[PDB]
Structure formats: C-alpha cells, structure tokens
Design a protein around this nucleic acid. Structure first.
Ligand SMILES: [Mg+2]
Ligand SMILES: [Mg+2]
Ligand SMILES: [Mg+2]
Ligand SMILES: [Mg+2]
Ligand SMILES: [Mg+2]
Ligand SMILES: [Mg+2]
Ligand SMILES: [Mg+2]
Ligand SMILES: [Mg+2]
Ligand SMILES: [Mg+2]
Ligand SMILES: [Mg+2]
Ligand SMILES: [Mg+2]
Lengths: 92, 143, 110, 21, 118, 354, 95, 51
RNA sequence: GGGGUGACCUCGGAGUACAAAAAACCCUCCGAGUGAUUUUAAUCUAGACAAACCAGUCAAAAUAACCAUAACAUCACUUA
RNA sequence: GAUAGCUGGUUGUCCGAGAAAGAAUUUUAGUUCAACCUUAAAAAUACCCCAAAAACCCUAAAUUCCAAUGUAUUUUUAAG
C-alpha cells in the first residue's frame, strides 16, 4: 500500500486507516476471495473489492455511517466503563 | 522459524464469561408455561421482606453474582427505615454501582404485574437505569 | 340406530422421544391433547401443546416445582387456594445440549 | 408413570376442595 | 391378554436346605452352566422361541456350555421351563492344549480331561 | 403395578382431611417464595440441577488465606444498636424518608462494604468468573485485604480495576498503580497473570508483571521479577481475564528459577502455572489480595504483537458447527424442491462430459 | 396405457401425467400439492405455504409415472434458462 | 450367579466386536468368481477323437 | 347376523381400548356442517409428528412494519 | 375368437426359500397401495435388553425406550 503510486496520498492514507485490519505487518494490503470455484471469478471479485475500497477512500462525501443493532452494546459498554474512568486523581 | 509463532489453531478460551459477553452464548429458551422466563444470562431479583430489601443479580445456574441488601451494615447504618421506598431506591443505586464495578451491564427484570406498578420498584428501576445498568439483555446472535 | 358418530381415528397423542435419546433442533419430543408434559430447558411449545427441541442434545424428564404465570387466573387462583405447605409439581421435559456453541479457529496469521 | 416411584407427584386435587344442624 | 411373565425375586432366593438338596456349594457358586433343551418351542410364544434360538439350544438333548453371569441368567430364567440346567464340574481341572482332543462330557455333568487312554 | 417412593413425598405431611382449619397462603408471592425454597432442596428424584450441572453439588473447598478478623460480636452488636437508635432518634431523617427525598453517601457505603463484607462478595465473584478453578483448581480464598489497582490514561485520567471490569489494552499499556493497607513489617508479592491468551497450551497462563518482596506498601521499591508487559489478546478470541494476585509472605523469599530477563519478550519463558508457583512457595506465601478484569482486542494489540513480541498478529474467528442434515434419500417423499440444495457441494453447474 | 399402438405398433403415453407432473433426469418426479387453489380464505398462511410448495413423489408413484410415460420424456433436455437444470442431476447420494 | 452385574460390564466385548467384523467381512467378500481360460477351452474336448 | 322394511354412510370428545401408539361391531353416550370480538394474524426456511397414497400437523434461525420486552388471532368442553 | 370381478380346466423330474389381511374403492365374489414374503446388490448394526425415564382422582396382567450380554440378524438399493 505504501509503494502503490497509482493512487493519491489521501486515498492511501484513508486505506491505511480504514482497512488496517487486512494490512500485513510488512505493509502489504491483502485481499482474499473464496466464493467461486473459478480463479477467474475469484480474481474478478478481488479486483471489484479493490475498486470499492478505492472509490470509498477517494470520494470525500463519505459520512461513515454505522449500524445500531451491533453498536448499541459497545456504546453502553463504553458509557459504563467511562462512568468508572471518570476518576480524577494525578499519578505517575 | 520464530519460536513464538506457534499458534495451535484450536484456541481454547476457558473464560466462562467470554461467550456471554460476546452475546453468542446459549441462552436458556424453553419453559414458556412457568414464570418467570429463564431465558437470560443475568437476572435481577428483588425480595421485599417486612423488614429488609434484598436485590440480587443471579446467573442462570442460580448462584448470586452481586447482591445489595439492607441487612448489610454499610446501608443499615446510613439509612433509616430500611423497608421504605427511599431504602428501595438506595439499594437500587448501590446495586447499580456494584454491577458497574463487577462489569455487568445487562440483566433482565421480570416483576409481577402488581410489583411493576408499585412506587418503590419503579424508583429502583429508574435508579438502576440511571446508574448505568440497563435492563433488556441483548439478543443472542444466531439464536 | 341411536348412537352415531362414535367412529374417529386416534390422534397418535404420545411421547416420541424418551429419556436418553439424542435429538436435533426441531425434533418433536412429545405431542399431547392436554398439558401432560411441560417444556423445560431448550424445549419449545407449539400452539397445539406439542414439544420440540430447540437445541441438539439428550432428552431428560424431571419432576419440578410449578410456578404459574401471574396472568393465568385459574392457575393463580388454585395457587392462592392451596394450603401453606403445598407445592405444585409437574413433569418437565428438557434437552441437555451436547454440542458447544462454537470454536475459535485461526483464520489468518497476518 | 404408574409403576414409577414418583407416581402421583403432581397429585393436587386433594389439597383443595372446589366442586348446618 | 397373554403377555410375558414377570417372576419376583423371591423365587430365586435359595433356602439353606436347597444346597444340600441339589448338591450345591453354599459359599461359592459354580462357574459354568450346562444347559440342555428338554421340551420343544412349538406351542410356545415367539419370544421364548427367539431366546431358545439365541441360546444355541435349537437341537434338543444336546448340552451347551454357557456362563454364570446375570446377562445369560435372565434368558435362562425366561426359558427355564424348557431346559435342564446343571453346573459344569471339572474334577481334573481345565483341559489344556495337549488334552483338548481326549476330553469328554459325562452324563452326570463332569468333563473328564483324560478320556479312554490307550 | 405400583412402586414405593424412594423417600418422602412432597405433599405428604399436611393433613388431607379437615382442610378448612388449615392455613392457606393467599399471596402469589408467598407461594413463589415457598416454591423457590423447596426447589433448592436435594430431592431424591430426577431434578433440573442434577442434569444441568450443579457442579457436583456441595464441595469441601480448601481455604488458603488469612483467618477472619476476631471481633467482639457482643460489643459490635451493642455499638450497632446504639448507632441505629441515634439515627432513629432524629426527626429530619424521618421527614426526609416520609417526603421520599433522601440521598445516600455512596462513597462511605462502598468503604464500609469493602471493609466488612466486600471480601466475600469478591470471593464469590471470582468463583463465578472461574479464577480459583484455573489458579488452584481445588481451593478458594477470601481477599481479606483490599487491593486498589488503577491505570493512568493521562494526567488527570485514572481508570480503576475492579473485580471483573473491562479495561482496554490502550489504557492498560503502562504499568498500573496499586494500593493496599499494610504495616511496615510485612512483605508482599504482586503477580499479574493472563488466564486466556496462551496460544500453545490451553492449561497454562501468561505472566505480565511479577514483583516480589514488597516492603509494606511501596510496590516500586520491591524487585520486579517479571517486567510489565501490556495485554495482547487475539483479535478473534476476545474477553480474556487478567488477575492481580497479592500474596503476603513471612520470610525473605529468594529464587533463581522464577526470575525473568530484563527484555522478557519470549512467550516460552512467559508461561506460568500458578498452581506450581504456589506449590513451590506455599510455606511463606499466602494470597490476601485479588483484582481481576476483562480485556478484549484493540488497535494497540497489533503494535504489541509486531514491535514487542516480534510476531505476526494472529486473527481468530468464532465458527459454528455445520448444520445437520439427515441421510439423503433416493426418493425423498413429499419433500420440497429445495431438498436437493441441502446436499449440494457448490452452487456451480458441473457439466460432466459435455 | 396402450402398450402396442394400432398405427405404428409403438407404446403410447398418457398425457395427464405430463400435464400435471415433471420428471427430472435423475429419476425424480415433481408435482404440485393437491388443493393449492381451493378455498384460500379458509386456510392458514402456514397451510397455504405448504400447499404452494412443490413436492416429490415416492418410488412406487415414480415407477408408475415411468411406466405411463414413454422414453421421449426421460431424455436429457438442455433448455435455455431452465430453472430445474440445477436439479436435473443428483449429488452426494451415498447409497 | 458367579459374577455380578457390575463385574460383568463389558467383560466380553472385544470378542463380540471381532465376531461382528468377521461377519461383515464375510458379507462384503461377495463378488462374481473369476472366469479362466480353461473353463472356455475345455468345451472343445467334447470332440476329441482317435486319430 | 339372507334379502326387503327400518337405520346408517363424512368429522371430533369419553368408555370399550386400566399404563407407548394403533385397534372393530346395526356397541354405550355427547356433539359439528358455525357464531361473537379485534390483536386482520407475512415471506422464506433448518429439523421433526402423522401417514398406503392424497391429504393433515408443528417449527428454530433470517427478513418488512408496530413495544424499540409479544404478535401462536381469542372465546364458546376447541377437539369437529 | 362379442363380453364376462362368475364357474370349470390348465400337460416332465428334483432342489431352495416361502405368505391368513391395515387403508381407499357403486367396494367388501374384485382391484390399488401399505405391512409381510421371493430373487439379486450395497452396507451396519440388528433382536434379547439391568438401572434411569413415560399425568394429572383409584387402578392388574404388562408395555415403550435403553446399556451389558447370548446370538446373527437388520436396514437400504433394483426387480417383483
Ligand atoms: Mg373413539
Ligand atoms: Mg378407526
Ligand atoms: Mg452481630
Ligand atoms: Mg342369521
Ligand atoms: Mg330404506
Ligand atoms: Mg413415524
Ligand atoms: Mg423467529
Ligand atoms: Mg371369454
Ligand atoms: Mg367382484
Ligand atoms: Mg427397564
Ligand atoms: Mg439397543
């Protein structure tokens, strides 16, 4: 990803930020497909995934919409843990 | 290769709270004919005796995880008339704080139709909700 | 002559799976006309009072206390009319799950 | 069941009756 | 209706005189059963027929050796009215591999190891 | 055929005759209490707990810990009754309770709780979370002394570590501050163990911070046997448990086998067995403090895996068992057309010879 | 069934079975549930779905339909955009 | 009896399993016999004359 | 229990058929060929009951709309 | 060479295995399915089955489901 010069620097930064879960420790972004039995269709799926990622990181109108059914639990947990984190005592 | 790179793909998580926190654990669906429903991970139980009030948070196996009782000296010495609505709201607040400390944020409450319309239990539920402990345990993923 | 209509086949109301049988999800455990066996853990209740397994496991039959729904007026009235030492017991059917919910497999060491 | 030692464990109609000189 | 028959346990409780009556040891039970089929399984229920077939007692008046375990004792109790049961006696010990071909089972229920020497 | 009950029947004690003179409960709550009390008794018939794991019923737990504080029960009850009478003698408290406008000193409540009955609640919470089951396997202790552990997230941000809390590895990156009341004549040992996270052995645990020979309360003065290591839980398998155990010791324990190097980045060297550790140091050490918390994967675990451990980040997944399908029949009678799709290997047309 | 015709001397086939049945190449016969269009206001949604669902035939009925049909209806058909082309074959049948 | 119900548990199980395996093998060995050249070439011997 | 006359022909409940299921008679008794009300009650699909076949029955998960905690329409012996 | 669910007749030897009826039917003098049985072929569990388990007012002989064990039988596939 860092050596990919056919994409702009903000696009590369947005890729490295969003898709860091699929980025190797050597900086190699890796996509994988297993849907079809044909390597032709598998490569087509990988290329389509890359196109979607490039378009999402290139468009500036991205609002970063999040779900609710799976995020309410995390929100409640974050609130309930900050309710304890709110202690204010200097240390270190 | 790297001596630390051994992975043993079959990863075993001996934590009994792991799947419960991941919301993929097997809830106890079932009875439907008896009351209350045993389909939960944690359950709030409020016992209002003629003298004291006891709010427990039990697991499905029946063990009490975290409890707040007016019989405890900490609330007994700080509170007068350990039976009244003030005491019920107090024990609700203390139980909410203790649940936040223990790391339990979700539980169910199945009161009787006459206990749900009462004044003490309404204030206890409000205090438990304001303390961070939210009722209505999340739905099990792939139930 | 005078007695008519007495001819009707049996509805096969009975117990399908006995204790110890390894069943799967959806397997009907027992069918009944009236409530003879009550569902317990991981045992659903159809609208025809039939009992089916919700998980895959071993069927068990137990005798357990009966606490009815506070809205079922007949049962609550019987409860409040019972003496001070009486406790209602019923025969419940449970399914003890054998297979775990899932395992943690290594998918990618990146 | 009839032949089981736990027969009549749900027997309850003898505890309530719901049917002077 | 004619069904199977449940036999209570009091039937199989030996009395202190039955040992002396039948020549049994009151302390240690025998080890092996010699079962022979005396009656036919005709005019008998199919479950009795099947028990007599799985016991290897198809041919009549031919003895068969079985264990003294409750598993086979159950079937022997089921068909006890068609068989004669004796204890297998070994006056000269178990037949070894050099005495297998010179053995015989006497009518009184003993298995001689050296039968008709020379 | 009839059989005799193998014990007492449930409703055989009350008299069936003369039911009108017998007292009844007119309260569904009374009946529910009676039923929940009768359901916890060890009946002689097949019950629900016997099949669904009462955990061998009653168990004789070995107590490895400090004795309870010997207090005068009579004087305690006397002073408690005096305090209650003094509290009830007021009139403003009665006015507040009548008007339903009264607050509670939650801080003082928590202090008194951890002073008198907090240890037992922490013990039962650890028993529920399975700390003793994986640390000693046969023995549960009572945290007699308290243990306040806190991570510093910034300059004024202090996140506490209670019994079972959730702490993010980003907050747990640095070594925390521990506090506990102790006189200047005793020695303590602190051990941070990760129960879940060992990739190779399931029955083993990881070390994160082991520091022994603590003079009184000064934890920084004591020699750290194992340098602090941030939590590194895998991405797939989440919610590992990290437990701080505090042991009180008598003698100045010295050991060269349990010592770790200054880097201490080898997972083979950072493999612990608290059972064997306590078996080795059972003569002097006695556990008195405990504080465990939950921890899942975050964006700092990749950094901890790459920079510190010099590894590749292992990613797991919660897979489910495949769905059960019966043996495929030659002529599936009255089955829907989708019966043939349940046994399809792949949704791709396969032309054999064409 | 006309086993020997009068004009050609061949074996004829009944048209009712081809009008109300469908033969997959694997030997299975597909049919509709009887009564899936009668009194739909009187039936439950579950029963209506059961009636709308297709169903297979058992071995005896399948052999009967094979006897009543000729060999022209047991051939391999490669239709353009055939919905049942995925079902024309059988997979993982361990007999 | 000689042995009790608890003592006779599984005392003869390997032998039963081996007997069932022998039965299965005897049933699975079913196949048509070999056809050899002699079976076909011996039919010419019906016309063996004296020269 | 010869035909004729008389009676019946389909569905459900109880006894016969005492405890898994099934079980006949021109055997003994009840009934049905629908009413009332609103919560107007969906799609898709694992796995099962029952059954010669045709038919009859349940039902987890996933989907759209309502509490963001139920939806099996209810009652009339509910079974017809 | 009308048609007969009706009656009568149906021609060498020996050997192997071998069936008494549940449901529909202008059907009960007959047919078509099921359950049995025959002939081949694939397999693996098949009967016997101690605990334990199967309802509520009283209820017998005994049933259902199951280890072990004693035997070798059973289930599917293709023709019937
Ligand atoms: Mg009837
Ligand atoms: Mg009938
Ligand atoms: Mg006291
Ligand atoms: Mg007559
Ligand atoms: Mg007439
Ligand atoms: Mg069936
Ligand atoms: Mg659903
Ligand atoms: Mg003619
Ligand atoms: Mg006829
Ligand atoms: Mg038994
Ligand atoms: Mg068996």
């Amino acid at each position: 990803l860092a050596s990919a010069d056919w994409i702009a620097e903000p696009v590369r930064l947005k890729l490295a930020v969003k898709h860091k879960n699929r980025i190797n420790r050597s900086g190699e972004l890796i996509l994988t497909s297993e849907c079809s039995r044909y390597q032709f269709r598998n490569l087509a799926d990988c290329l389509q995934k890359l196109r979607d990622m490039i378009a999402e990181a290139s468009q500036p109108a991205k609002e970063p919409s999040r779900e609710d059914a799976e995020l309410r639990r995390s929100r409640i947990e974050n609130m309930n843990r900050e309710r304890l984190r709110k202690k204010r005592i200097s240390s270190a | 290769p790297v001596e630390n790179e051994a992975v043993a793909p079959e990863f075993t998580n001996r934590n009994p709270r792991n799947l419960e926190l991941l919301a993929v654990a097997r809830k106890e669906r079932g009875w439907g004919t008896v009351w209350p429903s045993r389909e939960f991970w944690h359950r709030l139980r409020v016992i209002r005796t003629q003298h004291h009030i006891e709010a427990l948070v039990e697991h499905r196996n029946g063990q009490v995880v975290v409890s707040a009782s007016t019989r405890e000296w900490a609330i007994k010495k700080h509170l007068y008339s350990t039976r009244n609505v003030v005491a019920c709201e107090s024990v609700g607040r203390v139980l909410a704080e203790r649940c936040l400390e223990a790391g339990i944020n979700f539980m169910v409450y199945h009161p009787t139709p006459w206990e749900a319309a009462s004044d003490s239990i309404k204030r206890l539920q409000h205090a438990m909700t304001e303390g961070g402990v939210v009722l209505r345990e999340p739905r099990r993923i792939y139930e | 002559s005078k007695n008519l209509g007495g001819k009707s086949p049996g509805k096969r109301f009975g117990i399908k799976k006995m204790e110890g049988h390894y069943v799967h999800a959806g397997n009907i455990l027992a069918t009944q006309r009236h409530f003879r066996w009550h569902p317990g853990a991981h045992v659903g209740l159809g609208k025809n009072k039939c009992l089916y397994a919700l998980e895959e496991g071993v069927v068990r039959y137990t005798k357990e206390v009966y606490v009815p729904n506070p809205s079922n007026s007949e049962a609550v009235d019987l409860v409040t009319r019972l003496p001070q030492g009486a406790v209602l017991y019923k025969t419940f059917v449970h399914v003890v799950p054998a297979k775990p919910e899932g395992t943690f497999k290594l998918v990618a060491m990146l | 069941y009839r032949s089981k030692p736990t027969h009549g464990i749900g027997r309850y109609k003898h505890l309530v009756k719901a049917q002077v000189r | 209706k004619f069904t199977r028959s449940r036999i209570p346990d009091k039937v199989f409780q030996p009395s202190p005189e039955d040992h002396e009556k039948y020549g049994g040891d009151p302390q240690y039970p025998h080890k092996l059963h010699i079962v022979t089929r005396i009656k036919s399984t005709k005019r008998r229920p199919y479950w009795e027929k099947d028990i007599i077939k799985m016991l290897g007692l198809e041919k009549a008046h031919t003895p068969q050796v079985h264990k003294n375990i409750p598993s086979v004792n159950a079937k022997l109790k089921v068909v006890k009215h068609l068989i004669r049961i004796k204890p297998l006696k070994l006056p000269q010990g178990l037949p070894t591999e050099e005495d297998m071909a010179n053995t015989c089972l006497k009518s009184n229920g003993e298995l001689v190891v050296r039968w008709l020497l020379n | 055929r009839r059989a005799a009950p193998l014990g007492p029947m449930p409703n055989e004690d009350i008299d069936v005759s003369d039911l009108e003179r017998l007292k009844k409960y007119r309260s569904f709550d009374r009946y529910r209490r009676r039923a929940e009390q009768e359901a916890r008794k060890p009946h002689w018939w097949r019950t629900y707990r016997e099949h669904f794991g009462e955990e061998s019923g009653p168990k004789d737990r070995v107590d490895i810990g400090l004795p309870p504080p010997k207090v005068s029960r009579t004087q305690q009850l006397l002073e408690r009754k005096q305090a209650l009478r003094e509290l009830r003698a007021n009139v403003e408290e009665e006015r507040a309770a009548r008007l339903q406008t009264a607050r509670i000193p939650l801080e003082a409540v928590r202090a008194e709780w951890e002073r008198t009955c907090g240890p037992y609640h922490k013990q039962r919470l650890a028993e529920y979370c399975g700390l003793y089951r994986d640390l000693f396997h046969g023995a549960t202790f009572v945290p007699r002394v308290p243990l306040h552990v806190a991570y510093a997230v910034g300059e004024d941000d202090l996140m506490p570590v209670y019994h079972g809390n959730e702490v993010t590895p980003t907050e747990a990156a640095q070594a925390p501050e521990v506090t506990y009341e102790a006189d200047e004549g005793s020695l303590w040992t602190l051990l941070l163990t990760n129960l879940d996270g060992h990739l190779l052995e399931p029955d083993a645990e990881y070390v994160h911070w082991l520091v022994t020979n603590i003079p009184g309360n000064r934890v920084t003065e004591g020699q750290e046997t194992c340098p602090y290591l941030p939590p590194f839980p895998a991405r797939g398998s989440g919610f590992h448990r990290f437990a701080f155990l505090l042991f009180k010791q008598d003698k100045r324990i010295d050991f060269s086998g349990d010592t770790r190097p200054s880097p201490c980045y080898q997972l083979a060297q950072r493999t612990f067995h608290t059972f064997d550790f306590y078996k080795k140091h059972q003569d002097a050490m006695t556990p008195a403090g405990l504080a465990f918390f939950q921890c899942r994967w975050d964006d700092s675990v990749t950094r901890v895996f790459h920079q510190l451990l010099d590894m590749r980040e292992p990613v797991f997944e919660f897979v489910r068992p495949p769905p059960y399908h019966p043996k495929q029949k030659r002529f599936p009678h009255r089955q829907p057309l989708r019966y043939l799709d349940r046994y399809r290997d792949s949704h791709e047309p396969t032309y054999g010879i064409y | 069934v006309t086993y020997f015709s009068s004009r050609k001397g061949k074996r004829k086939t009944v048209k009712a079975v081809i009008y109300r049945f469908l033969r997959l190449h694997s030997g299975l016969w597909l049919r509709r549930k009887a009564g899936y269009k009668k009194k739909l206001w009187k039936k439950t949604a579950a029963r209506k779905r059961r009636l709308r669902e297709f169903v297979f035939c058992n071995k005896t009925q399948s052999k009967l339909l094979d006897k009543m049909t000729t060999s022209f209806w047991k051939r391999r058909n490669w239709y353009a955009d055939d919905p049942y082309q995925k079902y024309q074959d059988r997979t993982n049948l361990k007999v | 009896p000689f042995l009790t119900a608890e003592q006779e548990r599984g005392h003869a199980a390997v032998r039963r399993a081996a007997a069932f395996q022998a039965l299965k093998a005897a049933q699975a060995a079913r196949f048509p016999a070999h056809r050899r050249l002699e079976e076909q070439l011996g039919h010419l011997l019906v016309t063996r004359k004296w020269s």
